[PDB]
Amino acid sequence: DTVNCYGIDGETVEKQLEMPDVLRVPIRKDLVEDAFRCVRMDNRQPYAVSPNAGMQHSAHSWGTGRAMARVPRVSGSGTTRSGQGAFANFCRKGRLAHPTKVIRRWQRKFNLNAKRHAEAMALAATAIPPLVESRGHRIAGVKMIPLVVSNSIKEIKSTKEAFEMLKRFGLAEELARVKESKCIRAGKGKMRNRRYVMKKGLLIIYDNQSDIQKAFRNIAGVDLACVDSLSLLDLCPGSHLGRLVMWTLGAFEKLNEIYGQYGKEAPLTSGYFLPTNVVSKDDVESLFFSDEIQAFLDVPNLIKYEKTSRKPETIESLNPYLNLM
Amino acid sequence: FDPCLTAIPATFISHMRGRRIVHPSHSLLRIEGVKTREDAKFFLGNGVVSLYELSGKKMENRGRIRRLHGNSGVVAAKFERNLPPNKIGTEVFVKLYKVEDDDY
Amino acid sequence: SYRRKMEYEERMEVLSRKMNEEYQARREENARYALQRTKELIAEYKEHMKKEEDARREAEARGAFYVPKEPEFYVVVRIRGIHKVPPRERKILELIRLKKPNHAVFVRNNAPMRAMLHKVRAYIAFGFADIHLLRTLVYKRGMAKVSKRPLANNSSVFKIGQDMRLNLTNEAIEDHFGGRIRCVEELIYQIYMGTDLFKKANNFLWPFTLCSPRKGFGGRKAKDITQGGSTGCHYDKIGNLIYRMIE
Amino acid sequence: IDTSKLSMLSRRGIKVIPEEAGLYPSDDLPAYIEKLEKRMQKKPRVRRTDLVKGCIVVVLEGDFTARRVVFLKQVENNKALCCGPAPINNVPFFVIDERYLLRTSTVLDLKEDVNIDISTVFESKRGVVADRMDIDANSDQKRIENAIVDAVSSIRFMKRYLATPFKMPKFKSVSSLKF
Amino acid sequence: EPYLRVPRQRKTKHKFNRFHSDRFKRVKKSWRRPKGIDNRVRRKLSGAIKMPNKGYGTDKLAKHMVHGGFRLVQIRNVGDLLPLISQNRFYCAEVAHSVGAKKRIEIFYKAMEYGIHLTNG
RNA sequence: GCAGCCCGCAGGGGCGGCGAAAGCGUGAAACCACCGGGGCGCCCACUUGUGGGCCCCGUCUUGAAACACGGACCAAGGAGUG
RNA sequence: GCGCACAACUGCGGGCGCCUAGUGGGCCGCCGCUGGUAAGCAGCGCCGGCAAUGAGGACACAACCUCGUGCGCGGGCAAGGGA
RNA sequence: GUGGUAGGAGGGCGCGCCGGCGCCGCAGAAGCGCAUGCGUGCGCAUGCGUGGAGGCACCCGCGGCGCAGAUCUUGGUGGCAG
């Protein structure tokens, strides 16, 4: 397992890198989902009703004896609001019972080491071409997955040349799928400054020595993320593993520094070790057919019996010896 | 073809029932001239037809005399479609051939 | 990889076909043996009954009175339903395996079992079956209480709490009694002559889920038969209920 | 690496309209239907041993349905060859179901072989009174008709018997229904 | 026309309307299990309507079958016809309601090419 | 997006007029007019009008059809949350 | 430590831990009672029930009798009956 | 093996919005009305009519998430009653 590093020509193999040990991590899909749930509510902004809402009356219960329910009635006279019910959640213009507060816990804590494992497993999902095409990316034209582009990516100044560069990497069908997928959102979210939805396309991971922010950010279907700070919102957007990721050579060679190699600490991340699985081999249910296990087994009972009957004519017919006396 | 040429008329007297609960899949018939239980054994398994008209169009609801009922020659019959309680008191015609419980 | 899965599945395919042909040839050889062993034991039933009649008529040839040894088992039918049963009587009907009415069992003719039958005698009809009632009850409504054995070569590992009610085949009998009994008549013989294998033979029989009797119980079935009911010691006339209950 | 546990649920294949329903029971439905249709497979019907060749019988449910005829031969699929002789009662050769023949006690003395070319004989079903085409070439049917016209001539009133349509006996008891 | 003829076999022609949905128009006919203390349907008294049970469930293999043996398939475009090409006899295809008449024309023509039975047309 | 013609003191009506249509979006239910069809309130059975089975729900209660209380109807709202 | 050894009958898997609800107005029958002239009264014991148990039979009828209860079909019955 | 109040548990149906992912819509979306079908059931899908611009499915995530009752709240409407 060695990956090619392509020029902006898109066909010439410049280097042949080994796969970083992050991209060989066996993926715990539950752990990446558990971390994505808490990471998604990091920018969760508070909402609440007004603390006065519904409570701005001098309302009192009229008591019993007036052939009316005991709910607080709006005081005064001469208006249509007068005498109407107030203060209750069942009342019109009443305070909602259990009003929403801003002291709600909007953010969720997740252990930093467990979040780092899920970032590692979401990174390994991008290195699996069955996963990347399973989440909707059109990766037929793409050379490798992981597609690594050289650090001469920073010499692209205009986004016309950047769109042409992604075109000769076989991402033309991928970008066109995202650009045409732009449609208006289907709910009341279109009122709340979330009018347009489009699909998630290519993610480009770069480092500070290959900064391609200006020339690439405007292409529809291209997200850019620095390698020093990978969120799960980019790596598995929508809790669905296998984001199509194009690497620069600077970001790809830093993966063995951010997460380290197997059995070793990470150099750039203090006190991080890549996760250890509970199994060694892949597809451990296939170990059942190994001859080490297969010799160990007792012989199972494969006798297929006839279905029993309870009716007295059939079970006399099974042992037809009643009439012999 | 008259039904009374070859078939013995029997009056649909009741469904098979308790004092209150009625099981309408089995219809009780009183065959004419049959007055005892052993006399009605001659008609066990015999086919029976109930002839009626729907919008002036003649229909035959066919059945089988399934079991005896009582000591007085009343027999229980099961038909293709259950007899309506409107037809209680009307006649159904008991055939002189045996039919089977599967094949009416 | 994918090879070792497929070479496993055709290895179990051969092993399934091989041991199923072996199981069928076991069934045919057992049924061929069973047809012999019924005729041998029925002759032993006739010889045992003829010896008692010859013992009885020789005693009345002299002045004497001969009653034989009373049978090694009772046949017990649950008459009353499961409602309104006090906790002692409800427990005894559980240990007799009589959990519904119109259920029938064999219990041993013991002194402890006779005291158990006496305490629930307002709920049961019990008596003495002869060999014809014994054989009719087992051949017409006889099922086996069989524990599942998941391994073919190891009959020692099995499941405790789950017992299947299956047909009383020869192979079910041959598996329970480890080759000692292998036919239905040979199971009757342990019931009839009360051998050491009685407790194993009787418990191997599932309780006889009989029908309610033809022509009814003929009255008020809950009271004793000494008062006109159907509930108590039907000393040797217990076949007058049970033969009507089988079909 | 098996991606099938790792991947998102792929809905591109087949969208069955109740999504609780599966794709299609391609495996289990043949075993279920073959068990089901054998369950409503009606029982094999007993061929009755009551009818003898040349026994006079009255058809109960057919095209003719009150006609004294004579019984010739039991045919396959539960049918029976009968001919109340067409000179006498204007009834052609036919096959009906075996059960619709009410058996009467009197038998004719017919010695001829009844293994006829049954392939084209008009079969009378139960309820339909469908107007069949008239009489045909009758290769062996003319011979065996004349043999039972020979048989009916020996017995005195038997010609009027087969001509007269059947009337129900006046019921007094089931002993009176002996025939 | 089906590959295997599945009988209908619904265990009742009952509908299980909600209790008192005949008497009150505020009580819609969608079934709610009645939970009152004296309620005659919950108590299963004779004369009350029946409540849905596990016992009324149709057979697992006969379930959600249309036109005898077929199973319904939602179709939104001509691409949905492509997985149904091999399995014509197992599925009756149904175009979704929101599909426009322009795309219903292209579905109708490709379905008779691939031999797929459309319940809409 | 009008007032041409006929009628009316008039409001207006009718033939028209504009417009893709709506004519101050959609237009549920309660309820009402007319027309058409049919006469159990429900469940079952079938050959649809018969038979059989069904008291009023909620609730508190040892016990509710209760001569216990709440409920005219309908829509919307409406109660274990932070 | 060595040696001996599976112990009436019948049935049958069993033991233990953790967390938590509802409940803490009961009523009725049987048998046995206490107070009371008695009570569809009041208070107990044992078991069963209702409450929360439909269905059948009791003319209807929380508790009586039969008897439990998925949805059907077929049979046989129970209590109770058969002008 | 199959009753079930208080009660506990499991699996689903449904609603607003979210991150995704498959799509649909002026050649007519949602909604609505009437039908048909599916479904033990919550409910779902379609047809026709209306409508005139959005919507659906699934996976996820958040929740002010499901009503016949509260002399409920608000609005509308009956009978009473010409």
Ligand SMILES: [Mg+2]
């Ligand atoms: Mg407010």
Ligand SMILES: [Mg+2]
């Ligand atoms: Mg919406």
Ligand SMILES: [Mg+2]
């Ligand atoms: Mg409007």
Ligand SMILES: [Mg+2]
């Ligand atoms: Mg209570």
Ligand SMILES: [Mg+2]
């Ligand atoms: Mg009170």
Ligand SMILES: [Mg+2]
């Ligand atoms: Mg009440």
Ligand SMILES: [Mg+2]
């Ligand atoms: Mg009162």
Ligand SMILES: [Mg+2]
């Ligand atoms: Mg009131």
Ligand SMILES: [Mg+2]
């Ligand atoms: Mg609401």
Ligand SMILES: [Mg+2]
């Ligand atoms: Mg009292």
Ligand SMILES: [Mg+2]
């Ligand atoms: Mg009870």
Ligand SMILES: [Mg+2]
């Ligand atoms: Mg009762």
Ligand SMILES: [Mg+2]
């Ligand atoms: Mg009653």
Ligand SMILES: [Mg+2]
């Ligand atoms: Mg009987």
Ligand SMILES: [Mg+2]
């Ligand atoms: Mg239950």
Ligand SMILES: [Mg+2]
């Ligand atoms: Mg509950």
